[PDB]
Amino acid sequence: DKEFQVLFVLTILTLISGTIFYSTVEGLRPIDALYFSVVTLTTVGFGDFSPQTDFGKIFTILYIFIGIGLVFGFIHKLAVNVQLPSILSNLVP
Amino acid sequence: DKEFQVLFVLTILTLISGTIFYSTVEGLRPIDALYFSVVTLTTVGFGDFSPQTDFGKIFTILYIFIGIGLVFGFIHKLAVNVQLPSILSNLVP
Amino acid sequence: DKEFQVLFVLTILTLISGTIFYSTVEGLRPIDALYFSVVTLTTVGFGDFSPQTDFGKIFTILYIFIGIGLVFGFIHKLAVNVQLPSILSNLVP
Amino acid sequence: DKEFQVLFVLTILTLISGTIFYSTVEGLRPIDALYFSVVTLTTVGFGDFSPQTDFGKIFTILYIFIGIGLVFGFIHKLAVNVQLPSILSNLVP
Numbered sequence: 001d002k003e004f005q006v007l008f009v010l011t012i013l014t015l016i017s018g019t020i021f022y023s024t025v026e027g028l029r030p031i032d033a034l035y036f037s038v039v040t041l042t043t044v045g046f047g048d049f050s051p052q053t054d055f056g057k058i059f060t061i062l063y064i065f066i067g068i069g070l071v072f073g074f075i076h077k078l079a080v081n082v083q084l085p086s087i088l089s090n091l092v093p
Numbered sequence: 094d095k096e097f098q099v100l101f102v103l104t105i106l107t108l109i110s111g112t113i114f115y116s117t118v119e120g121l122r123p124i125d126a127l128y129f130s131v132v133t134l135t136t137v138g139f140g141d142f143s144p145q146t147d148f149g150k151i152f153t154i155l156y157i158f159i160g161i162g163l164v165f166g167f168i169h170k171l172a173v174n175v176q177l178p179s180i181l182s183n184l185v186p
Numbered sequence: 187d188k189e190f191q192v193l194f195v196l197t198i199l200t201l202i203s204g205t206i207f208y209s210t211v212e213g214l215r216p217i218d219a220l221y222f223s224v225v226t227l228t229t230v231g232f233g234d235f236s237p238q239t240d241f242g243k244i245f246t247i248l249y250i251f252i253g254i255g256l257v258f259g260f261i262h263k264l265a266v267n268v269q270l271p272s273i274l275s276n277l278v279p
Numbered sequence: 280d281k282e283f284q285v286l287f288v289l290t291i292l293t294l295i296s297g298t299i300f301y302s303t304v305e306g307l308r309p310i311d312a313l314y315f316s317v318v319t320l321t322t323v324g325f326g327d328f329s330p331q332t333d334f335g336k337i338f339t340i341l342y343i344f345i346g347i348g349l350v351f352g353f354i355h356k357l358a359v360n361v362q363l364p365s366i367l368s369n370l371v372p
């Protein structure tokens with residue numbers, strides 16, 4: 001759970017950075033910037049938002065390489081250290 | 094296989110929740126809501142459907158973080174506990 | 187390598203099924219059907235092609251769940267049993 | 280770290296090949312070609328750029344199968360051999 005808290009914090013910080021970047025450089029509303037950051041790093045990539053400027057494209061390349069690892073790290077421990085135990089506890093006779 | 098049944102149920106429940114959410118808040122036909130939920134959680138993300146409302150964007154962020162884990166959990170055991178054995182059995186001299 | 191050949195065959199068969207399905211039901215040229223099948227199962231999902239009919243949407247949900255496992259299985263052994271050794275061999279003093 | 284350097288080089292080479300291919304055959308500006316290559320191999324797939332020619336579609340199928348493995352290989356060691364240690368070092372009393 002201490003591991004989970006660190007991943008949670010790191011993930012929050014990563015998403016804040018994307019929110020601030022895309023809101024500024026790509027002109028997105030903050031909520032659309034956050035949404036886009038999440039859709040990007042979880043590799044869903046709907047493409048309803050995508051960077052139009054070269055600065056945005058370049059940041060996006062780096063953001064993906066740096067962020068995918070910890071976002072999926074976080075997701076994995078969420079699933080294994082949080083969701084898994086609660087599901088098991090729901091089953092117990 | 095008992096593990097497989099729990100993942101199957103959990104996956105069904107997750108997809109039902111997305112179906113109901115997107116049908117209501119985003120106004121999708123139920124079938125398009127289900128399809129979109131699956132396209133989202135499996136991280137394919139075609140983007141033919143994507144949330145237009147802030148409520149939908151916010152739900153989508155959370156749905157992704159919560160759902161990716163069990164959807165890929167389910168997929169993994171489907172592949173390893175169901176598809177794998179049947180493929181092996183097809184090969185046997 | 188025998189494992190690699192089975193995954194290769196299974197992957198080919200999966201892509202043929204998608205090629206035939208999308209060419210017929212969704213009216214795609216065979217090459218676009220194959221391309222779309224690959225873009226779908228590798229979870230890239232550009233969305234330049236996406237199913238427009240309910241039959242296509244329903245097939246796509248099932249195709250994703252069934253196909254992701256073996257496509258990524260194949261990719262993983264391609265990377266570990268084929269690409270890895272060749273890269274190592276290129277390095278050897 | 281020697282492993283990390285090899286993956287880094289291999290990833291660079293893979294992205295250069297995509298940059299050159301899409302710039303030429305699909306007529307993209309080099310920066311858009313690089314961006315698209317990364318968006319493709321990391322499986323984000325926004326679809327703002329996607330191949331329009333059959334040559335491009337065929338290359339893309341092969342590029343995905345060959346490139347996903349080493350791109351995710353690189354990402355994984357970046358996360359585990361580079362980001363992980365630095366994060367731990369930031370925590371130390």
Ligand SMILES: [K+]
Binds near residue numbers: 135
């Ligand atoms: K993906």
Ligand SMILES: [K+]
Binds near residue numbers: 043045136231323324
């Ligand atoms: K995707």
Ligand SMILES: [K+]
Binds near residue numbers: 325
């Ligand atoms: K897309």
Ligand SMILES: [K+]
Binds near residue numbers: 043047139140232
């Ligand atoms: K996508």
